[PDB]
Amino acid sequence: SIKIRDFGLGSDLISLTNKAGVTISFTNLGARIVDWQKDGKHLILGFDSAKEYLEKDAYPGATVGPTAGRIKDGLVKISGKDYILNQNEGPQTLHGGEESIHTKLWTYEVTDLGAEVQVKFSLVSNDGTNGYPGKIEMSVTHSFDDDNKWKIHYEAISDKDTVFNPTGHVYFNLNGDASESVENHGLRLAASRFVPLKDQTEIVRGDIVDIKNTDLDFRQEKQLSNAFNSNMEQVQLVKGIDHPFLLDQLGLDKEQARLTLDDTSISVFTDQPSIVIFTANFGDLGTLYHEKKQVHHGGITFECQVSPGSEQIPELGDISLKAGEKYQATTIYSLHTKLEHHHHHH
Amino acid sequence: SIKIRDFGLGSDLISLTNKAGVTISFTNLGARIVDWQKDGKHLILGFDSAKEYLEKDAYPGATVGPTAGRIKDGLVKISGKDYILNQNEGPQTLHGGEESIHTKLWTYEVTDLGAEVQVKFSLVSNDGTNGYPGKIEMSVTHSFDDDNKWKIHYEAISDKDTVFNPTGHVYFNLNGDASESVENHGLRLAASRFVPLKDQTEIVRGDIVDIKNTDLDFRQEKQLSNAFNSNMEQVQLVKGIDHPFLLDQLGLDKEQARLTLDDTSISVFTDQPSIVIFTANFGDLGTLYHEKKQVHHGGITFECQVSPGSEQIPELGDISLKAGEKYQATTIYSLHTKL
Ligand SMILES: C[C@H]1O[C@H](O)[C@H](O)[C@@H](O)[C@H]1O
Ligand SMILES: C[C@H]1O[C@H](O)[C@H](O)[C@@H](O)[C@H]1O
Ligand code: NA
Numbered sequence: 181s182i183k184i185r186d187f188g189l190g191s192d193l194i195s196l197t198n199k200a201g202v203t204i205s206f207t208n209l210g211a212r213i214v215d216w217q218k219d220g221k222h223l224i225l226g227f228d229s230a231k232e233y234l235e236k237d238a239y240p241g242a243t244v245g246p247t248a249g250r251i252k253d254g255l256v257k258i259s260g261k262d263y264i265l266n267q268n269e270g271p272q273t274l275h276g277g278e279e280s281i282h283t284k285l286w287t288y289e290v291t292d293l294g295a296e297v298q299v300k301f302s303l304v305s306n307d308g309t310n311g312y313p314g315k316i317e318m319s320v321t322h323s324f325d326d327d328n329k330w331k332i333h334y335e336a337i338s339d340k341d342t343v344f345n346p347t348g349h350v351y352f353n354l355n356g357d358a359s360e361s362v363e364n365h366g367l368r369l370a371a372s373r374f375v376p377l378k379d380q381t382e383i384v385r386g387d388i389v390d391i392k393n394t395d396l397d398f399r400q401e402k403q404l405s406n407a408f409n410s411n412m413e414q415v416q417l418v419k420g421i422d423h424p425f426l427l428d429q430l431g432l433d434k435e436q437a438r439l440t441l442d443d444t445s446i447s448v449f450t451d452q453p454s455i456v457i458f459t460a461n462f463g464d465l466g467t468l469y470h471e472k473k474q475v476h477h478g479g480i481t482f483e484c485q486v487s488p489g490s491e492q493i494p495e496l497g498d499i500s501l502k503a504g505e506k507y508q509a510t511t512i513y514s515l516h517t518k519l520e521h522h523h524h525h526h
Numbered sequence: 527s528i529k530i531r532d533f534g535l536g537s538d539l540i541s542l543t544n545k546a547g548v549t550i551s552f553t554n555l556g557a558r559i560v561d562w563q564k565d566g567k568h569l570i571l572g573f574d575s576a577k578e579y580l581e582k583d584a585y586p587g588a589t590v591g592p593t594a595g596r597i598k599d600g601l602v603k604i605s606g607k608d609y610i611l612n613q614n615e616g617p618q619t620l621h622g623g624e625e626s627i628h629t630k631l632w633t634y635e636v637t638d639l640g641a642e643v644q645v646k647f648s649l650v651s652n653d654g655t656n657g658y659p660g661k662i663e664m665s666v667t668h669s670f671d672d673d674n675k676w677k678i679h680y681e682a683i684s685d686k687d688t689v690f691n692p693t694g695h696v697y698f699n700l701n702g703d704a705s706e707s708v709e710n711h712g713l714r715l716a717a718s719r720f721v722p723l724k725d726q727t728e729i730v731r732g733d734i735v736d737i738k739n740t741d742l743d744f745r746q747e748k749q750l751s752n753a754f755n756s757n758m759e760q761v762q763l764v765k766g767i768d769h770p771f772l773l774d775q776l777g778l779d780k781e782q783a784r785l786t787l788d789d790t791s792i793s794v795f796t797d798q799p800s801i802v803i804f805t806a807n808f809g810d811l812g813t814l815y816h817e818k819k820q821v822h823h824g825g826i827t828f829e830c831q832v833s834p835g836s837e838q839i840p841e842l843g844d845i846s847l848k849a850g851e852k853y854q855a856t857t858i859y860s861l862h863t864k865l
Contacts, residue, residue: 184532189633190554192536208536208631230633266653279650279661285554285631287535287576304625307612308654315625 182290182297187214188230191285196297199326202515209233210242210282211301211320213350216330218515221356223446225469225479234283236467242282243320243334244275245346246305246312247499249424249456249488252383256491258313258500259341265311270381277310282349286320296325313340320346328515336507344507345486345499351460351479354441358469361477362459363405364526368438369398371425371455375487375496376414384489388426396421401438403524404459408477420461420477424454424487426496432510437482438519445519450484450511453497457482484511528636528643533560534576537631542643545672548861555579556588556628557647557666559696562676564861567702569792571815571825580629582813588628589666589680590621591692592651592658593845595770595802595834598729602837604659604846605687611657616727623656627664628695642671659688662847666692674861682853690847691832694857697806697825700787704815707823708805709751714784715744717771717801721833721842722760728768730835734842742767747786750805754823766807766823770800770833772842778856783828795858796830799843803827830857 187193191209204216209230216223225240227233233240247256247265254265254273266277275282286301300321307314321333332348353362372392376385391397395410407421415421427436430453437448437455448455458481466473490496501507533539537555551561555576562569571586573579579586593602593611600611600619612623621628632647646667653660667679678694700711718738722731737743741756753767761767773782776799783794783801794801806825813820836842847853 186530186538189635190538190631191633192532209633277652279652283650285536285633287537287555287631289535304629306623306625306655308657309652311654 182292189234191230194288194290194299196324198324198328199295200328202328204324204330206299206322208286208288208301210238210284211286211288211303211322212243212282213241213322213330213348216515218444222470223352223354223356223444223515225351225353225358225474228470238282239275239349241350242348243301243346244280244282244349245318245344246276246281246316247273247343247345248275248347248483248485249345250274250382251488251491254311256343258343263311263313272381272383273311280310281305281318296323298323307340313338313342315339316342316344318346329512330514331510331512334507334509336501337505338501338503341503342501343499344501346509347456347483347485348511349481349483350513351481352439352446353479354439354444354446357472358467358474358478359472361475362480363403363408363477364441364524365404365480366401366440366522366524367398367404368401369425369455370428370434370436372399372428373426374414375424375426375454375489375493377417377423380417382418382422384492386492388493388495401440404477404480405526408459418461419463420459422456422458422461424456424489426454426487432512439480439482440520440522442522443518445516447514447516447519448482448484448512449514450509452484452486452509452511454487455482455484456488482513485509528638530636535580537576538634540634540636540645542645542670544670544674545641546674548674550670550676552645552668554632554634554647556584556630557632557634557649557668558589558628559587559668559676559694562861564790564863568816569698569700569702569790569861571697571699571704573815584628585621585695586697588695589647589692590626590628590695591664591690592622592627592662593619593689593691594621594693594829594831595691596620596728597834598837600657602689604689609657609659618727618729619657626656627651627692632666642669644669653686659684659686661685662688662690664692676859676861678857680853680855682847683851684847684849687846687848689845690853691845692855693802693829693831695827695829696859697827698785698792699825700785700790700792703818704813704820704824705818707821708826709754709823710749710787711826712747712749712786713744714747714786715771715801715803716775716780716782717773718743718745719772721770721772721835721839723763723769726763728764730838732838734772734839747784750826754805764807765809766805768804768807770802770835772800772833778858785826785828789864791862791864793860793862794828794830795860797856798830798832800831800833802829802831802834804829828859
């Protein structure tokens with residue numbers, strides 16, 4: 181079943197329920213996921229109206245770009261030319277600049293396929309918007325099926341050589357309450373290396389470090405508290421995790437990550453090379469989610485994309501997009517029950 | 527009463543009916559007027575869904591900008607510096623460039639004041655969008671009241687010196703049917719001069735011309751067919767009217783123009799210095815409105831703004847917007863029915 185209603189300020193809320201009774205909902209403001217529930221419990225963080233996003237925090241669950249992450253000094257090199265993008269975090273360009281795509285109302289069309297329902301959102305980034313050559317015709321399709329898979333498919337074409345590396349910014353919290361830390365969740369992540377940050381500004385340090393056998397090694401499932409309690413420099417720097425992890429094996433076919441709490445697991449699949457994980461290191465900010473004050477570590481993202489810092493570490497990849505060339509990315513979050521035995525106490 | 531409904535592609539249709547039973551409707555797609563009707567008759571041109579505007583013609587009823595009109599070679603000088611804007615009509619920048627603000631979904635808020643209802647649309651034009659310095663935070667408030675007055679109030683603030691001169695692009699047709707020419711309407715217009723066009727590219731010619739006592743003099747009510755059957759080179763050039771008229775007296779209290787058909791009249795009020803009038807000179811294009819094929823001259827606009835061409839004829843005015851300055855503009859369309 182598909183239901184639509186106004187969500188505030190002119191945005192709409194699109195709610196889908198699959199054959200299993202799982203419901204998930206999106207909004208065209210930022211081509212964003214708003215909620216995902218199983219048996220009455222929220223699996224992610226979200227607000228109850230469009231205004232909350234604009235007033236409290238506009239990133240949760242949004243589509244961010246054109247480039248996700250921080251670009252040191254807003255500087256990119258496109259076809260031998262240097263371009264300076266909007267700088268909204270000190271001299272850095274963070275998540276595409278100020279008032280980026282996550283803040284716009286995208287147009288959308290819903291396609292009902294029976295076992296799968298697709299919500300395709302569209303937006304055009306005009307040439308020069310925030311410094312980015314364009315125009316860029318973008319589209320994000322969010323779909324949910326009877327197998328409990330929520331898939332995100334990105335597509336884009338530019339009139340000019342530009343850069344493109346968007347991501348989905350959902351925050352999960354299997355406690356179903358923002359005021360509860362995700363330290364009690366188990367995390368499995370197929371990555372042997374990470375990208376350290378230079379300092380508090382969060383630009384990349386310049387090197388790639390192996391994390392096997394450290395507190396950031398999650399190849400084998402472990403509680404998130406292990407990282408949070410860590411005194412490793414990088415953890416202390418950000419007060420949790422806020423880094424890109426380099427996937428060891430690429431391919432949409434492999435389970436790159438798995439987040440579990442009791443009988444519920446979320447599996448992550450993607451065709452991208454890294455996953456930036458940020459664990460809501462907000463301290464005492466206490467943003468209210470459904471009237472609950474969010475706690476430090478009250479959520480975790482899995483931003484699949486090309487790792488930020490490629491400007492400094494070419495080995496990370498190349499996010500350039502040639503004129504006329506079609507960009508595509510696919511990321512999938514799948515819900516499972518009793519995938520494994522996870523019985524712990526904090 | 528207020529009624530909000532889905533208009534397609536995620537856009538909304540907001541309809542307002544006043545004490546008089548008159549209905550006016552808008553959509554957030556392009557902060558635009560979609561319909562305006564009395565006793566079941568359409569007063570303006572409009573489509574039935576968002577899709578139509580995108581596939582047929584995105585201008586009707588829209589808020590166009592940041593700069594309305596044509597800019598020669600897409601070139602503007604800002605703080606002594608040359609800036610090239612998006613060129614979407616040959617080398618000109620027309621109505622702000624491609625995929626401009628008329629094609630975007632604006633956010634909005636409705637405010638019910640009882641005798642008056644306001645719909646405030648907002649949008650941010652990022653710095654650099656289509657070549658324009660910014661960011662520009664814009665708001666367009668469309669309001670309707672029990673006196674049958676449809677008002678448009680614009681406001682904007684820019685982070686950087688830029689240019690700004692938007693307009694409302696509603697097309698009127700008192701016939702209530704696009705397949706019928708507006709040649710039968712009578713027009714009055716308080717303007718003694720106009721801005722001639724250079725040629726078919728529609729860029730300005732360079733001069734300002736007195737129209738007193740010509741086929742374009744409407745200081746005294748006259749029927750459109752007059753102008754339409756004129757042999758004035760400028761009329762022949764565009765096959766109708768597609769020109770900026772300079773208002774003789776500025777100020778919002780003065781009725782600047784009046785469009786009449788029988789018992790029904792539309793008065794125009796504005797704080798802008800000029801009115802661009804375009805008589806839907808589409809030839810055989812035949813765009814479909816409500817299933818009716820549009821005819822050449824099947825509509826007329828009253829685009830109030832600073833006249834286009836100021837880049838070549840400074841006397842016309844200056845559309846610059848300095849950083850931090852608040853831009854404001856107001857245009858009113860008032861409906862009257864003779865009893
Ligand atoms: C909003 C968040 O988005 C990402 O996860 C960044 O890496 C974090 O530092 C923060 O900017
Ligand atoms: C869409 C129309 O908008 C204005 O009225 C212009 O002057 C006309 O030439 C046409 O471009
Ligand atoms: Na809606």
